[PDB]
Design a protein around this ligand. Structure first.
Ligand SMILES: O=C(CC[C@H]1CCOC1)N1CCCC1
Ligand SMILES: O=C(CC[C@H]1CCOC1)N1CCCC1
Lengths: 193, 193
Protein backbone atom coordinates (compact mmCIF):
# COMPACT_ATOMS: atom_id res chain seq x y z
CA UNK A 1 0.00 0.00 0.00
CA UNK A 2 2.44 2.69 1.21
CA UNK A 3 5.08 0.65 -0.70
CA UNK A 4 3.34 0.86 -4.04
CA UNK A 5 2.99 4.60 -3.37
CA UNK A 6 6.75 4.88 -2.48
CA UNK A 7 7.62 2.79 -5.51
CA UNK A 8 5.72 5.13 -7.79
CA UNK A 9 7.43 8.23 -6.12
CA UNK A 10 10.91 6.59 -6.47
CA UNK A 11 10.23 5.77 -10.13
CA UNK A 12 9.09 9.27 -10.94
CA UNK A 13 12.18 10.79 -9.18
CA UNK A 14 14.41 8.42 -11.18
CA UNK A 15 12.77 9.15 -14.53
CA UNK A 16 12.82 12.88 -13.87
CA UNK A 17 16.71 12.69 -13.79
CA UNK A 18 16.65 11.83 -17.52
CA UNK A 19 13.65 13.51 -19.08
CA UNK A 20 11.00 16.13 -18.27
CA UNK A 21 7.45 15.42 -16.90
CA UNK A 22 5.97 15.87 -20.44
CA UNK A 23 8.12 12.98 -21.74
CA UNK A 24 7.09 10.63 -18.91
CA UNK A 25 3.81 8.63 -19.10
CA UNK A 26 1.51 7.18 -16.45
CA UNK A 27 2.31 3.83 -18.11
CA UNK A 28 6.01 4.67 -17.63
CA UNK A 29 5.44 5.31 -13.89
CA UNK A 30 3.25 2.25 -13.53
CA UNK A 31 5.80 -0.01 -15.35
CA UNK A 32 8.71 1.19 -13.18
CA UNK A 33 6.70 0.66 -9.96
CA UNK A 34 5.64 -2.79 -11.14
CA UNK A 35 1.83 -2.12 -11.14
CA UNK A 36 -0.78 -1.67 -13.82
CA UNK A 37 -2.08 1.61 -15.09
CA UNK A 38 -5.46 1.42 -13.27
CA UNK A 39 -3.62 0.47 -10.07
CA UNK A 40 -1.49 3.68 -10.48
CA UNK A 41 -4.72 5.70 -10.60
CA UNK A 42 -5.76 4.31 -7.34
CA UNK A 43 -2.74 5.92 -5.58
CA UNK A 44 -2.49 9.20 -7.65
CA UNK A 45 -4.92 10.98 -9.92
CA UNK A 46 -2.25 11.99 -12.47
CA UNK A 47 1.52 12.19 -13.09
CA UNK A 48 1.27 15.90 -12.11
CA UNK A 49 -0.03 14.77 -8.72
CA UNK A 50 3.00 12.57 -8.33
CA UNK A 51 5.32 15.57 -8.91
CA UNK A 52 3.28 17.61 -6.41
CA UNK A 53 3.84 15.01 -3.78
CA UNK A 54 7.53 14.71 -4.58
CA UNK A 55 7.89 18.56 -4.29
CA UNK A 56 5.83 18.61 -1.15
CA UNK A 57 8.18 16.10 0.49
CA UNK A 58 11.32 18.05 -0.57
CA UNK A 59 9.92 21.41 0.63
CA UNK A 60 8.88 20.00 3.94
CA UNK A 61 12.26 18.30 4.46
CA UNK A 62 13.92 21.71 4.01
CA UNK A 63 11.34 23.37 6.26
CA UNK A 64 11.82 20.77 9.04
CA UNK A 65 15.60 21.05 8.76
CA UNK A 66 15.37 24.81 9.10
CA UNK A 67 12.99 24.40 12.17
CA UNK A 68 15.68 22.12 13.75
CA UNK A 69 18.35 24.72 13.22
CA UNK A 70 16.12 27.44 14.61
CA UNK A 71 15.58 25.39 17.82
CA UNK A 72 19.32 24.48 18.02
CA UNK A 73 21.42 27.60 17.36
CA UNK A 74 24.94 26.66 16.11
CA UNK A 75 27.68 28.14 18.39
CA UNK A 76 29.57 30.34 15.96
CA UNK A 77 29.67 33.90 14.57
CA UNK A 78 26.83 35.53 12.63
CA UNK A 79 28.36 34.85 9.18
CA UNK A 80 28.53 31.12 9.95
CA UNK A 81 24.97 31.23 11.43
CA UNK A 82 23.54 32.55 8.09
CA UNK A 83 25.71 30.08 6.18
CA UNK A 84 24.25 27.13 8.16
CA UNK A 85 20.76 28.41 7.41
CA UNK A 86 21.22 28.85 3.62
CA UNK A 87 23.04 25.53 3.60
CA UNK A 88 19.77 23.72 4.58
CA UNK A 89 18.38 24.80 1.18
CA UNK A 90 21.61 24.22 -0.73
CA UNK A 91 21.80 20.62 0.59
CA UNK A 92 18.13 19.71 0.57
CA UNK A 93 17.21 20.97 -2.87
CA UNK A 94 20.71 20.14 -4.24
CA UNK A 95 20.11 16.51 -3.15
CA UNK A 96 16.95 16.55 -5.24
CA UNK A 97 17.88 18.45 -8.39
CA UNK A 98 15.52 16.55 -10.71
CA UNK A 99 12.43 17.22 -8.50
CA UNK A 100 13.64 20.85 -7.92
CA UNK A 101 13.92 21.43 -11.67
CA UNK A 102 10.58 19.77 -12.55
CA UNK A 103 8.88 21.53 -9.57
CA UNK A 104 10.06 24.86 -10.84
CA UNK A 105 8.86 24.18 -14.36
CA UNK A 106 5.42 23.05 -12.97
CA UNK A 107 4.83 26.45 -11.23
CA UNK A 108 3.69 27.82 -14.62
CA UNK A 109 0.98 25.19 -15.09
CA UNK A 110 -0.05 23.88 -11.72
CA UNK A 111 -1.83 26.21 -9.32
CA UNK A 112 -1.22 23.58 -6.62
CA UNK A 113 2.59 23.73 -7.23
CA UNK A 114 2.45 27.56 -7.36
CA UNK A 115 0.53 27.70 -4.09
CA UNK A 116 2.74 25.18 -2.29
CA UNK A 117 5.84 27.19 -3.33
CA UNK A 118 4.28 30.53 -2.41
CA UNK A 119 3.21 29.29 1.03
CA UNK A 120 6.62 28.06 2.06
CA UNK A 121 8.39 31.13 0.47
CA UNK A 122 6.17 33.31 2.72
CA UNK A 123 7.10 31.20 5.74
CA UNK A 124 10.88 31.39 5.03
CA UNK A 125 10.85 35.13 4.31
CA UNK A 126 8.88 35.75 7.52
CA UNK A 127 11.44 33.70 9.50
CA UNK A 128 14.27 35.63 7.73
CA UNK A 129 12.66 38.97 8.56
CA UNK A 130 12.14 37.83 12.29
CA UNK A 131 15.84 37.07 12.58
CA UNK A 132 16.86 40.37 11.01
CA UNK A 133 14.50 42.21 13.41
CA UNK A 134 16.03 40.37 16.39
CA UNK A 135 19.44 41.36 15.17
CA UNK A 136 18.42 44.99 14.89
CA UNK A 137 16.78 44.95 18.40
CA UNK A 138 19.98 43.53 19.89
CA UNK A 139 21.96 46.30 18.13
CA UNK A 140 23.97 43.92 15.88
CA UNK A 141 22.35 45.10 12.62
CA UNK A 142 21.54 48.68 11.45
CA UNK A 143 18.00 49.80 10.71
CA UNK A 144 18.29 50.26 6.92
CA UNK A 145 15.58 48.80 4.62
CA UNK A 146 12.19 47.37 5.91
CA UNK A 147 13.34 43.94 7.15
CA UNK A 148 10.52 42.15 5.37
CA UNK A 149 11.36 43.70 1.94
CA UNK A 150 15.09 42.96 2.47
CA UNK A 151 14.13 39.34 3.42
CA UNK A 152 11.95 39.00 0.31
CA UNK A 153 14.69 40.07 -2.17
CA UNK A 154 17.34 37.90 -0.48
CA UNK A 155 15.18 34.76 -0.46
CA UNK A 156 14.21 35.45 -4.14
CA UNK A 157 17.90 35.80 -4.98
CA UNK A 158 18.62 32.43 -3.32
CA UNK A 159 15.71 30.74 -5.13
CA UNK A 160 16.85 31.98 -8.57
CA UNK A 161 20.68 31.57 -7.99
CA UNK A 162 20.58 28.10 -6.33
CA UNK A 163 18.24 26.77 -8.94
CA UNK A 164 20.34 28.21 -11.85
CA UNK A 165 23.48 26.64 -10.26
CA UNK A 166 21.77 23.24 -9.85
CA UNK A 167 20.50 23.25 -13.48
CA UNK A 168 23.90 24.39 -14.80
CA UNK A 169 22.14 27.33 -16.58
CA UNK A 170 24.04 29.91 -18.60
CA UNK A 171 24.72 32.18 -16.72
CA UNK A 172 25.04 30.65 -13.24
CA UNK A 173 27.37 30.65 -10.25
CA UNK A 174 29.24 27.34 -10.11
CA UNK A 175 27.65 25.07 -7.56
CA UNK A 176 30.94 24.83 -5.52
CA UNK A 177 30.87 28.67 -5.24
CA UNK A 178 27.19 29.47 -4.76
CA UNK A 179 27.03 29.05 -0.93
CA UNK A 180 29.92 31.52 -0.29
CA UNK A 181 28.52 33.95 -2.90
CA UNK A 182 25.03 34.10 -1.28
CA UNK A 183 26.37 34.22 2.30
CA UNK A 184 28.46 37.30 1.35
CA UNK A 185 25.48 39.16 -0.10
CA UNK A 186 23.20 38.25 2.87
CA UNK A 187 25.82 39.29 5.44
CA UNK A 188 26.83 42.56 3.83
CA UNK A 189 23.22 43.54 3.06
CA UNK A 190 21.93 42.63 6.57
CA UNK A 191 24.85 44.14 8.65
CA UNK A 192 26.09 46.88 6.21
CA UNK A 193 25.09 50.55 6.92
CA UNK B 1 4.81 46.08 -45.15
CA UNK B 2 6.64 47.22 -42.00
CA UNK B 3 3.19 48.54 -40.90
CA UNK B 4 1.45 45.21 -41.13
CA UNK B 5 4.39 43.79 -39.14
CA UNK B 6 4.08 46.60 -36.51
CA UNK B 7 0.33 46.11 -36.42
CA UNK B 8 0.74 42.43 -35.67
CA UNK B 9 3.37 43.23 -32.89
CA UNK B 10 1.06 45.92 -31.36
CA UNK B 11 -1.88 43.48 -31.40
CA UNK B 12 0.08 40.72 -29.75
CA UNK B 13 1.38 43.15 -27.02
CA UNK B 14 -2.22 44.29 -26.42
CA UNK B 15 -3.67 40.78 -26.23
CA UNK B 16 -0.86 39.61 -23.96
CA UNK B 17 -2.09 42.20 -21.32
CA UNK B 18 -5.29 40.14 -20.92
CA UNK B 19 -4.45 36.51 -21.58
CA UNK B 20 -1.43 34.23 -22.01
CA UNK B 21 0.17 33.18 -25.37
CA UNK B 22 -1.64 29.78 -25.20
CA UNK B 23 -5.04 31.55 -25.18
CA UNK B 24 -4.19 33.74 -28.18
CA UNK B 25 -4.60 32.42 -31.77
CA UNK B 26 -2.92 33.31 -35.06
CA UNK B 27 -6.46 34.21 -36.20
CA UNK B 28 -6.70 36.48 -33.13
CA UNK B 29 -3.43 38.25 -34.13
CA UNK B 30 -4.45 38.43 -37.77
CA UNK B 31 -7.94 39.85 -36.90
CA UNK B 32 -6.50 42.56 -34.63
CA UNK B 33 -3.93 43.59 -37.26
CA UNK B 34 -6.63 43.67 -39.93
CA UNK B 35 -5.07 40.98 -42.23
CA UNK B 36 -5.92 37.41 -43.10
CA UNK B 37 -4.38 34.35 -41.58
CA UNK B 38 -2.19 33.48 -44.61
CA UNK B 39 -1.04 37.11 -44.76
CA UNK B 40 0.05 36.79 -41.06
CA UNK B 41 2.21 33.80 -42.04
CA UNK B 42 3.98 35.85 -44.55
CA UNK B 43 5.35 38.18 -41.81
CA UNK B 44 5.86 35.59 -38.97
CA UNK B 45 6.08 31.82 -38.96
CA UNK B 46 4.08 31.42 -35.72
CA UNK B 47 2.64 33.31 -32.72
CA UNK B 48 5.75 32.16 -30.77
CA UNK B 49 7.86 34.03 -33.33
CA UNK B 50 5.85 37.14 -32.69
CA UNK B 51 6.63 36.92 -28.93
CA UNK B 52 10.32 36.36 -29.74
CA UNK B 53 10.39 39.54 -31.72
CA UNK B 54 8.53 41.48 -29.05
CA UNK B 55 11.06 40.21 -26.39
CA UNK B 56 13.95 40.92 -28.68
CA UNK B 57 12.85 44.54 -29.04
CA UNK B 58 12.38 44.99 -25.25
CA UNK B 59 15.77 43.42 -24.42
CA UNK B 60 17.57 45.52 -26.95
CA UNK B 61 15.85 48.71 -25.76
CA UNK B 62 17.19 47.99 -22.25
CA UNK B 63 20.61 47.09 -23.64
CA UNK B 64 20.83 50.31 -25.70
CA UNK B 65 19.68 52.40 -22.74
CA UNK B 66 22.36 50.84 -20.58
CA UNK B 67 25.01 51.49 -23.36
CA UNK B 68 23.91 55.18 -23.32
CA UNK B 69 24.37 55.40 -19.60
CA UNK B 70 27.74 53.71 -19.81
CA UNK B 71 28.91 56.33 -22.37
CA UNK B 72 27.36 59.20 -20.33
CA UNK B 73 28.23 58.75 -16.64
CA UNK B 74 25.69 60.56 -14.38
CA UNK B 75 27.44 63.11 -12.07
CA UNK B 76 26.51 61.79 -8.65
CA UNK B 77 27.73 59.41 -5.92
CA UNK B 78 28.21 55.66 -6.39
CA UNK B 79 24.85 54.70 -4.81
CA UNK B 80 23.00 56.92 -7.30
CA UNK B 81 25.20 55.58 -10.18
CA UNK B 82 24.06 51.96 -9.46
CA UNK B 83 20.49 53.17 -8.99
CA UNK B 84 20.49 54.81 -12.46
CA UNK B 85 21.80 51.57 -13.94
CA UNK B 86 19.22 49.23 -12.32
CA UNK B 87 16.58 51.81 -13.14
CA UNK B 88 17.12 51.16 -16.92
CA UNK B 89 15.77 47.63 -16.31
CA UNK B 90 13.07 48.69 -13.86
CA UNK B 91 11.69 51.22 -16.39
CA UNK B 92 12.20 49.29 -19.60
CA UNK B 93 10.81 45.95 -18.53
CA UNK B 94 8.25 47.63 -16.20
CA UNK B 95 6.93 49.53 -19.25
CA UNK B 96 6.40 46.18 -20.94
CA UNK B 97 5.06 43.91 -18.22
CA UNK B 98 2.90 41.76 -20.51
CA UNK B 99 5.84 40.94 -22.88
CA UNK B 100 8.17 40.50 -19.83
CA UNK B 101 5.77 38.01 -18.26
CA UNK B 102 5.09 36.06 -21.49
CA UNK B 103 8.85 36.15 -22.36
CA UNK B 104 9.68 34.62 -19.04
CA UNK B 105 7.08 31.89 -19.40
CA UNK B 106 8.40 31.12 -22.96
CA UNK B 107 11.96 30.39 -21.66
CA UNK B 108 10.73 26.89 -20.69
CA UNK B 109 9.55 26.03 -24.20
CA UNK B 110 11.45 28.12 -26.68
CA UNK B 111 15.18 27.53 -27.10
CA UNK B 112 15.26 30.80 -29.08
CA UNK B 113 13.79 32.74 -26.09
CA UNK B 114 16.15 30.91 -23.68
CA UNK B 115 19.16 31.74 -25.85
CA UNK B 116 18.20 35.39 -26.36
CA UNK B 117 17.79 35.80 -22.56
CA UNK B 118 21.02 33.95 -21.78
CA UNK B 119 23.02 36.03 -24.26
CA UNK B 120 21.98 39.38 -22.88
CA UNK B 121 22.23 38.13 -19.21
CA UNK B 122 25.88 37.23 -20.00
CA UNK B 123 26.44 40.68 -21.49
CA UNK B 124 24.92 42.52 -18.47
CA UNK B 125 26.77 40.41 -15.89
CA UNK B 126 30.05 40.97 -17.76
CA UNK B 127 29.42 44.75 -17.78
CA UNK B 128 28.52 44.56 -14.03
CA UNK B 129 31.70 42.62 -13.25
CA UNK B 130 33.81 45.19 -15.35
CA UNK B 131 32.43 48.04 -13.26
CA UNK B 132 33.07 46.24 -9.99
CA UNK B 133 36.66 45.50 -11.14
CA UNK B 134 37.18 49.18 -12.03
CA UNK B 135 35.91 50.11 -8.61
CA UNK B 136 38.30 47.71 -6.94
CA UNK B 137 41.28 48.95 -9.07
CA UNK B 138 40.49 52.55 -8.08
CA UNK B 139 40.39 51.45 -4.42
CA UNK B 140 36.67 52.31 -3.90
CA UNK B 141 35.56 48.67 -3.43
CA UNK B 142 37.22 45.86 -1.40
CA UNK B 143 38.46 42.66 -3.02
CA UNK B 144 35.94 40.21 -1.51
CA UNK B 145 34.18 37.65 -3.78
CA UNK B 146 35.22 36.97 -7.47
CA UNK B 147 33.61 39.98 -9.19
CA UNK B 148 32.05 37.84 -11.89
CA UNK B 149 30.31 35.49 -9.38
CA UNK B 150 29.11 38.50 -7.31
CA UNK B 151 27.80 40.07 -10.59
CA UNK B 152 26.01 36.85 -11.55
CA UNK B 153 24.08 36.52 -8.23
CA UNK B 154 23.14 40.21 -8.18
CA UNK B 155 21.82 40.23 -11.75
CA UNK B 156 19.91 36.95 -11.02
CA UNK B 157 18.42 38.58 -7.93
CA UNK B 158 17.28 41.57 -10.03
CA UNK B 159 15.78 39.30 -12.71
CA UNK B 160 13.75 37.27 -10.19
CA UNK B 161 12.77 40.23 -7.87
CA UNK B 162 11.80 42.74 -10.61
CA UNK B 163 9.80 40.17 -12.45
CA UNK B 164 7.99 38.99 -9.23
CA UNK B 165 7.20 42.67 -8.42
CA UNK B 166 5.87 43.34 -11.94
CA UNK B 167 3.65 40.20 -11.88
CA UNK B 168 2.41 41.00 -8.36
CA UNK B 169 3.50 37.46 -7.25
CA UNK B 170 3.11 36.24 -3.69
CA UNK B 171 5.69 36.88 -2.25
CA UNK B 172 7.12 39.99 -3.92
CA UNK B 173 8.57 43.39 -3.05
CA UNK B 174 6.03 46.09 -3.88
CA UNK B 175 6.91 47.72 -7.16
CA UNK B 176 7.23 51.21 -5.50
CA UNK B 177 9.87 49.68 -3.15
CA UNK B 178 11.82 47.32 -5.40
CA UNK B 179 14.35 49.87 -6.81
CA UNK B 180 15.49 51.03 -3.32
CA UNK B 181 15.58 47.41 -2.06
CA UNK B 182 17.87 46.19 -4.90
CA UNK B 183 20.12 49.29 -4.81
CA UNK B 184 20.75 48.65 -1.07
CA UNK B 185 21.77 45.04 -1.63
CA UNK B 186 24.01 45.91 -4.65
CA UNK B 187 25.73 48.76 -2.78
CA UNK B 188 26.33 46.94 0.48
CA UNK B 189 27.47 43.74 -1.27
CA UNK B 190 29.80 45.59 -3.72
CA UNK B 191 31.36 48.11 -1.20
CA UNK B 192 30.98 46.13 2.10
CA UNK B 193 34.09 44.37 3.55
O1 LIG C 1 18.02 29.93 0.68
C1 LIG C 1 16.82 30.06 1.00
C2 LIG C 1 16.37 30.43 2.39
C3 LIG C 1 17.50 31.00 3.23
C4 LIG C 1 17.36 30.66 4.70
C5 LIG C 1 18.49 31.25 5.53
C6 LIG C 1 17.85 31.66 6.86
O2 LIG C 1 16.46 31.79 6.54
C7 LIG C 1 16.10 31.23 5.28
N1 LIG C 1 15.83 29.82 0.17
C8 LIG C 1 16.08 29.28 -1.15
C9 LIG C 1 14.79 28.52 -1.41
C10 LIG C 1 13.72 29.32 -0.69
C11 LIG C 1 14.41 30.02 0.48
O1 LIG D 1 18.75 44.85 -13.14
C1 LIG D 1 19.42 44.25 -13.99
C2 LIG D 1 20.79 44.69 -14.45
C3 LIG D 1 21.41 45.70 -13.49
C4 LIG D 1 22.29 46.71 -14.21
C5 LIG D 1 22.92 47.70 -13.24
C6 LIG D 1 24.32 47.97 -13.78
O2 LIG D 1 24.59 46.84 -14.61
C7 LIG D 1 23.44 46.04 -14.90
N1 LIG D 1 18.97 43.19 -14.64
C8 LIG D 1 17.60 42.74 -14.46
C9 LIG D 1 17.33 42.09 -15.80
C10 LIG D 1 18.66 41.53 -16.25
C11 LIG D 1 19.74 42.41 -15.61
Amino acid sequence: GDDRELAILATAENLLEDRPLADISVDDLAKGAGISRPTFYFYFPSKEAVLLTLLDRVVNQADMALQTLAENPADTDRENMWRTGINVFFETFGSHKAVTRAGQAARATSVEVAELWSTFMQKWIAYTAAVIDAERDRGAAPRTLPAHELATALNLMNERTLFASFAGEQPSVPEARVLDTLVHIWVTSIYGE
